[PDB]
Design a protein around this ligand. Sequence first.
Ligand SMILES: Cc1cc2nc3c(=O)[nH]c(=O)nc-3n(C[C@H](O)[C@H](O)[C@H](O)COP(=O)(O)O)c2cc1C
Lengths: 141, 353, 807, 94
Amino acid sequence: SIDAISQVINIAKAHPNFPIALQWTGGRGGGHHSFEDAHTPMLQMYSKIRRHPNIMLIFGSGFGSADDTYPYLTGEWSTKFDYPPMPFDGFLFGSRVMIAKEVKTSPDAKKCIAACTGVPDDKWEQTYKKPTGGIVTVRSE
Amino acid sequence: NILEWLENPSNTPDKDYLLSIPISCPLIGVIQLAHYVVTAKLLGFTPGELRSYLKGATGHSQGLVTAVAIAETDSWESFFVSVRKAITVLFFIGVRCYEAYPNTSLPPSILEDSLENNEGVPSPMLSISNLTQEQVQDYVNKTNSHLPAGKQVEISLVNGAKNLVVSGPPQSLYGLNLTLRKAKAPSGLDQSRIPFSERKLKFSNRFLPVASPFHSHLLVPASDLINKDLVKNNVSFNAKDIQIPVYDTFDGSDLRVLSGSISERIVDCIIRLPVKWETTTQFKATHILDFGPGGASGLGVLTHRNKDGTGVRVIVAGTLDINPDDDYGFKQEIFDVTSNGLKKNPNWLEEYH
Amino acid sequence: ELKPTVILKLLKENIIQMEMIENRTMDGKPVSLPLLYNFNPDNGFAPISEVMEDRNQRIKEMYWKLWIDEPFNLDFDPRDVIKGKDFEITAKEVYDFTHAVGNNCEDFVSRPDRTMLAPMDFAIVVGWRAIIKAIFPNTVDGDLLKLVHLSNGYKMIPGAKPLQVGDVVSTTAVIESVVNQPTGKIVDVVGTLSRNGKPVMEVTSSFFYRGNYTDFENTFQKTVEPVYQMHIKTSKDIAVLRSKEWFQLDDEDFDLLNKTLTFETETEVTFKNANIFSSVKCFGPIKVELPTKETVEIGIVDYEAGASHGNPVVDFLKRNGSTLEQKVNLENPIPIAVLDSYTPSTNEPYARVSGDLNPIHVSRHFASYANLPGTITHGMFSSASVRALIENWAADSVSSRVRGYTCQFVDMVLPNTALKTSIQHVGMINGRKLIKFETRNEDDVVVLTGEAEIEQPVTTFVFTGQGSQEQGMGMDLYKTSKAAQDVWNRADNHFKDTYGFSILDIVINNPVNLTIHFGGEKGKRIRENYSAMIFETIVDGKLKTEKIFKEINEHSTSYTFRSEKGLLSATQFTQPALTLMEKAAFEDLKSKGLIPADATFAGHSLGEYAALASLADVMSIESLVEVVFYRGMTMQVAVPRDELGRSNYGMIAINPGRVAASFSQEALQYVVERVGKRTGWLVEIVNYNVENQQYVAAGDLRALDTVTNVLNFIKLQKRGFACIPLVGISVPFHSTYLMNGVKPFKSFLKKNIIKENVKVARLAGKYIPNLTAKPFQVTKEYFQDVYDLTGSEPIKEIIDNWEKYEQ
Amino acid sequence: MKPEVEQELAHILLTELLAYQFASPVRWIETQDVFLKDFNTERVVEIGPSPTLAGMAQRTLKNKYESYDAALSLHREILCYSKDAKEIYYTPDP
Ligand SMILES: Cc1cc2nc3c(=O)[nH]c(=O)nc-3n(C[C@H](O)[C@H](O)[C@H](O)COP(=O)(O)O)c2cc1C
């Protein structure tokens, strides 16, 4: 969340020479997830993060191809929100590789994963209530 | 008697009388002109040379008059001519706009209700932050449907994407505030466990320290009076005299290319038309000097927040201080001779390309 | 600039003239007051004496030049009425006045789409000439330089609007009283400001000529006495009253016994000296209270006497009667605010705006000559400033709310002085708040006191109908309040005498059964009362006179009212009890001065009947409970019943927003309409209470049971779920079932509602009936609407013959 | 019209209204509209043993006049005689 990002900034400030990898992910990622939008917290905190050169900005939660990450690599994503371009330092792909040949997912599990169609970002919030794109949200212990 | 007040603070009128626009308009103009003078003088420059160093100039509502007057200056002899022009225009703006819509006492019950809810004293201008122009216009329309024509409110200053100001009668603005606080979540509400889409929008509102509804239909009757008076007082701005672009506050266009009277357009912009600050500021520049009042709370900091990450540096020439963030300069940066006098703000598209 | 203020020369060989000059005149030409002195060199210890002959005339001539723009003439009668010049109110004048007195109320500031009002204090500007011309006559002789303004007052005439720019005002002034006192002569003046021919407000100014006066042949006095009340109990009181020569009744055979009389008199006296009167005249009307609490004139007080030491009429009324006081004090004052105010540094602007060019406020030499502490600020400026404070705070800056304001000038005030006024809400008067104020200066000395009358915020009184009538309702007020006791005791006495039962007993104890015994002569009279009443009805356009209490005949020795859990739930006892509870509560409110005169009102079902008795006073208490008891008994016999007083019909409340979020009223009104039509029984909607949230249906208790089930089935697709049962109702009120009774009911009301007890002014624009949700008006459009919804023949006789009645 | 003829007509109108009221539906909706909007009302005082019409008026205000009341700055006050004695009588406790 925003407060977590502030805590990360404080850590990076306490050790200005040590590299810190700020892995940012929205609530739309796989597995354990939060309630946050993927874009608003970044639009709020990008400037504060770039105040500190030792922070490396990674973007994740929802990427699976060069086409959908290139706008974030060039920073052109933030212009759609009437902001200046805000390039990112890297990306992480969690769900995208779960059907890779070297992962230990069972073949039927791989087929099940592939059969999911997913949903665009503007509707990911419709997993708290019912299946959407083959995925749903449930509570842990 | 401003000299008497400056000499003896003990016999200076109270804050409210100073804040009345017939006082504060020319006084703020004088403050801006004095700051411009100090800068020039310290830099060992004439007003003409300093203006020649500028790519352009503009002003936020009342500041536009100072902008065009500064653009007029050529040397220390004609500077007093320009100053007289500017403060004449401001004096008459204050006088006629106070005559058109003078301030009147508000019922004490409303004052008490506003104070008891962490709200300010009502005034003719309300600042609403963290809301789009569409949302604020929606609330304004809702409020205005219930009100007669003469008491309607409107958006005056479009300061930013989330920064808007509504001008109108203090009673109407109070009613709008009631509507807004009926639709605002408490600041101390935790919504980290609620989905983002369903989260109740949070925002803030406050009344500006002003005493007249600028850029409002209420001051419209004073436009003709001001125009008729300035021709008698011998105040006029010629496009040839202006030698740097001065951007209109309604459309950001250059005033030098205006077909009609520049003074008429300036008064219209101040009293009638809204300020589209983002539209005005579309110019490309590396440094922006803020002479206006307010210091760290003035227009320079607002413009810096609007323009963050575009490689633009804001220097507030009116005050001396230290910014821990160092994101914008102070009076010293204008005169520093080391590299500390040349600070570039970050341009993300270029730094992290 | 520098100008000659005082000159000193020898107007003769032995006379010194000191010409004191006032330069701030109305025309700009200076005016000189020549003071003459004798110089006698023979008396070396005191060679200079003052020439007294005509000194007062010279001072009055100066002040006449300063104040009055008419030819100088002091020989006019103080008893006569002074007429003031017409005044045209302009925006400039209101602006100047408001700025001079520091009043920033928005009502007086020009704004778009709103005409600008003039402040109440502007009345002095309008009428000062007429008011001050009263103290000039040579018969009211005095030194104007020692004149002291004791107090000033404003008083809006009820139903008169505030002054507004564009008005033309006329002023008239009369001296109310001029009496000699040991410390000087007091002159009380009353001005009346009239707009368009109607009077708007009255100004009362009291002046003081300090000195020693003994010209009692020029003095007189007028006092409006407090209203005195007398309850004539015994024949002794009647005899004593008839002994007084002044007590004169037009109807010599009037029955004063057990009557309440009110005396409202005025005393006009002349004086022979400080202690004795040379003529006394007390006069006025005598009025008698009626069962409807309306007082009607029955005679005139008429006392005239020559030399006397007192007024015997007032003494008699004081000792035997009681005085009615309009003002009613709260048990504890409510502080409003303590405010800071400052006097201007110059008195000139207020003088110029008001026309009060008294030199003592502006001219140092005149103020020194008068032995004043300086150029004191005008008392009227202080009054206007404090009234502006009160209006801003006590009236929440609503100018029209201030109807009266009076101030007393207890001490002088100098310019540049910090004042501290404390404002308190202390009492009520006739529905208006009573505000007291007290203004002190830096030294903590009271300099100004007075009171204000602030109208309450726009009010509506709403009277509840039949519902959950609880045991003991209205009994706490009954214990504490005297007006409540009057209402309840009159009703209980009537019920005991007429029907052998106490309504108070039913309210307090709620018995399951109540037996009436017809033994003895009183029992036989009560039995006859029971036998007489009937339930007339219209069947196919024909009268059908039934009889309530068919069990009661001339051989009956008792009768028992029955119920299941208490008779307070029964209609005939619940309706009068609720009516009395509400009437008692409203009478208590009235007795405390809490009822605004313009309060609009309405009643929900039964409440309407109670509201009319409370605010319109159309019927006395005995008639009110009598008709409500008759109607309640009629309802019992309108529906078939059983033992314990039950019925087949019923009522339920319906929340259309509970069956579905999209179920409109017109949808429910459609379903219920069809359900009855599609089933042939009686069911409809009787009370539209809250939009799409509260509708009440009345009809067959079986049919209503289906209605809930159906809506319960509607709510199942695209107490009770949306139908709660309204306890306490056992008849289909407000339903087409009861349409027959409307004919007999109209006859019964037209009988009991007295023609002379209906005051339109108490109903017009205030009463909103349930039949037409429109304020009551005697107009063809109102009768047209009445006929439209519910055709009535007398109504259209009014319609079709309107030209005859209107003319 | 003359005051006497006016009184005669008013008596006829009042008798007719009272007679027909109990056999025709109660339009409390229009009445609440009238006295909350056409006159406005900063204090509505309910005279009765319980807050029935006070609750009705509070719901009507909550559902039909929130924006209008806020815009025109009305501090409406719904008081019932049964529960709101202090505000009716101006006797706030110390
Ligand atoms: C199957 C799965 C297991 C995960 N396990 C962890 C974990 O153990 N610890 C952790 O911090 N994040 C875990 N994550 C979150 C990922 O590190 C990453 O934030 C997320 O997968 C990126 O969003 P995306 O799935 O839309 O690409 C997991 C994600 C998935 C899909």
